[PDB]
Structure formats: structure tokens, C-alpha cells
Amino acid sequence: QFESTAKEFNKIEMRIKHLSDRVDDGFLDVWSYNAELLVLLENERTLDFHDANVNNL
């Protein structure tokens, strides 16, 4: 989806700003963890893919 930077609340709404801050923290943790293990899993499978092709010749 279209990414936005409008994340500002007024001076007496710091709690809403904190909610916005932790919402972005949550997605940061979700994407970081999924991205790390995606690359780790696929790299192990890619090397196995080459081994299978060599064995198949």
C-alpha cells in the first residue's frame, strides 16, 4: 500500500503518538524476523537445489 509519513499528533496527545510509535515497532519486528528467516531458509534450499541437479546428472 501507499506509504505515508503523516504520523504527527498534537501536543496533548502524546499517548496517541506512542501508539503510533509502537505500531511501527510491531511491523518492524514482524518484517525483520520474517525477512531474516526467509533468506536463511531459501539459501539452504537453493544450495540443496544445486546439489539435486548435480546428483541428477
Binding site: 501507499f2 505515508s4 509519513t5 503523516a6 504520523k7
Partner: protein, 161 residues
Amino acid sequence: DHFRKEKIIDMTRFSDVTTNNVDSACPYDTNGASFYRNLNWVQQNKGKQLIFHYQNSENNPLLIIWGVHQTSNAAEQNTYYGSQTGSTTITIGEETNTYPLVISESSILNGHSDRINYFWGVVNPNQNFSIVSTGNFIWPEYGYFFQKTTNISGIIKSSEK
């Protein structure tokens, strides 16, 4: 997708009052005393009531910005407006916004113990707005016709060009 300044109110049609009032807290590039281009400061209402009506016959919503003057004391209120009154009700479509007269010192900033507080609203196409004021009002002489876009971006804070 579109953004035009236009003139929305002919300020010359209000009688027994002064318009285009200025102040040294808002100089031009030279120096001196000026004021916001789109906002017209009206003084010396003298308790008299002013009425204005408008209809957005444009095919785009209209953004208007106004201000309400909070004076420091009875003397300052008397000098600017000549009456211990001055209250504005601005109606946009079906909302009503009422700004009763408020007199109170504040700490002095830019040589001002008084304040002008700014508000805004959106007049949709074929919708109306009206102003009833007895003083202490800064009129939305100019406004911006604009076209909304769905994807919201925000503000980039940087010193770069």
C-alpha cells in the same frame, strides 16, 4: 491534484469599520508593518454586527482560514474595536462555530500580550458558509480551491533543496 488561491470576500462591502489592518510583528521583506495576505483584520466594529454569506459554486472544495482576536484588557479591546463586545459565529454547511469575546493577558511574544488564534474549515462544492461578527475577527478574505487525492503522503522535514 489542484490548488488555487482565490478571493472569496469583498471586504469593501462592510461599512463603518476598518479593513486590511496590519502590525509590525509581520513585516514585509523590507521591514515595517504588514499582515497575512489571505487573512483580513477588521477593527473598530464598535459593537455593530456584520453579516456575510457565500456559496461554493466551484467544482472543488474550498479551504478557508480565519482568526479570532483575544485582547489583553478592556483598554486594548476599546482601542481596537471601540466596544467591550465582539463575537463571531461562522457556519460551514451544518456545523456552527462560535467564538465569544475573550479578554485576558498572555505573556508578551513579538511585542504582543494579546493573541490571534487561527482556525480553518472546508466548504464542499455547492455547500455554503456564513459569518456573523460584532468584532475581534480576522476574515478569510482569500481561500484555496483544492482537489483531494486518495494516497496521503505527509511532510518531509529537511533543509535541502
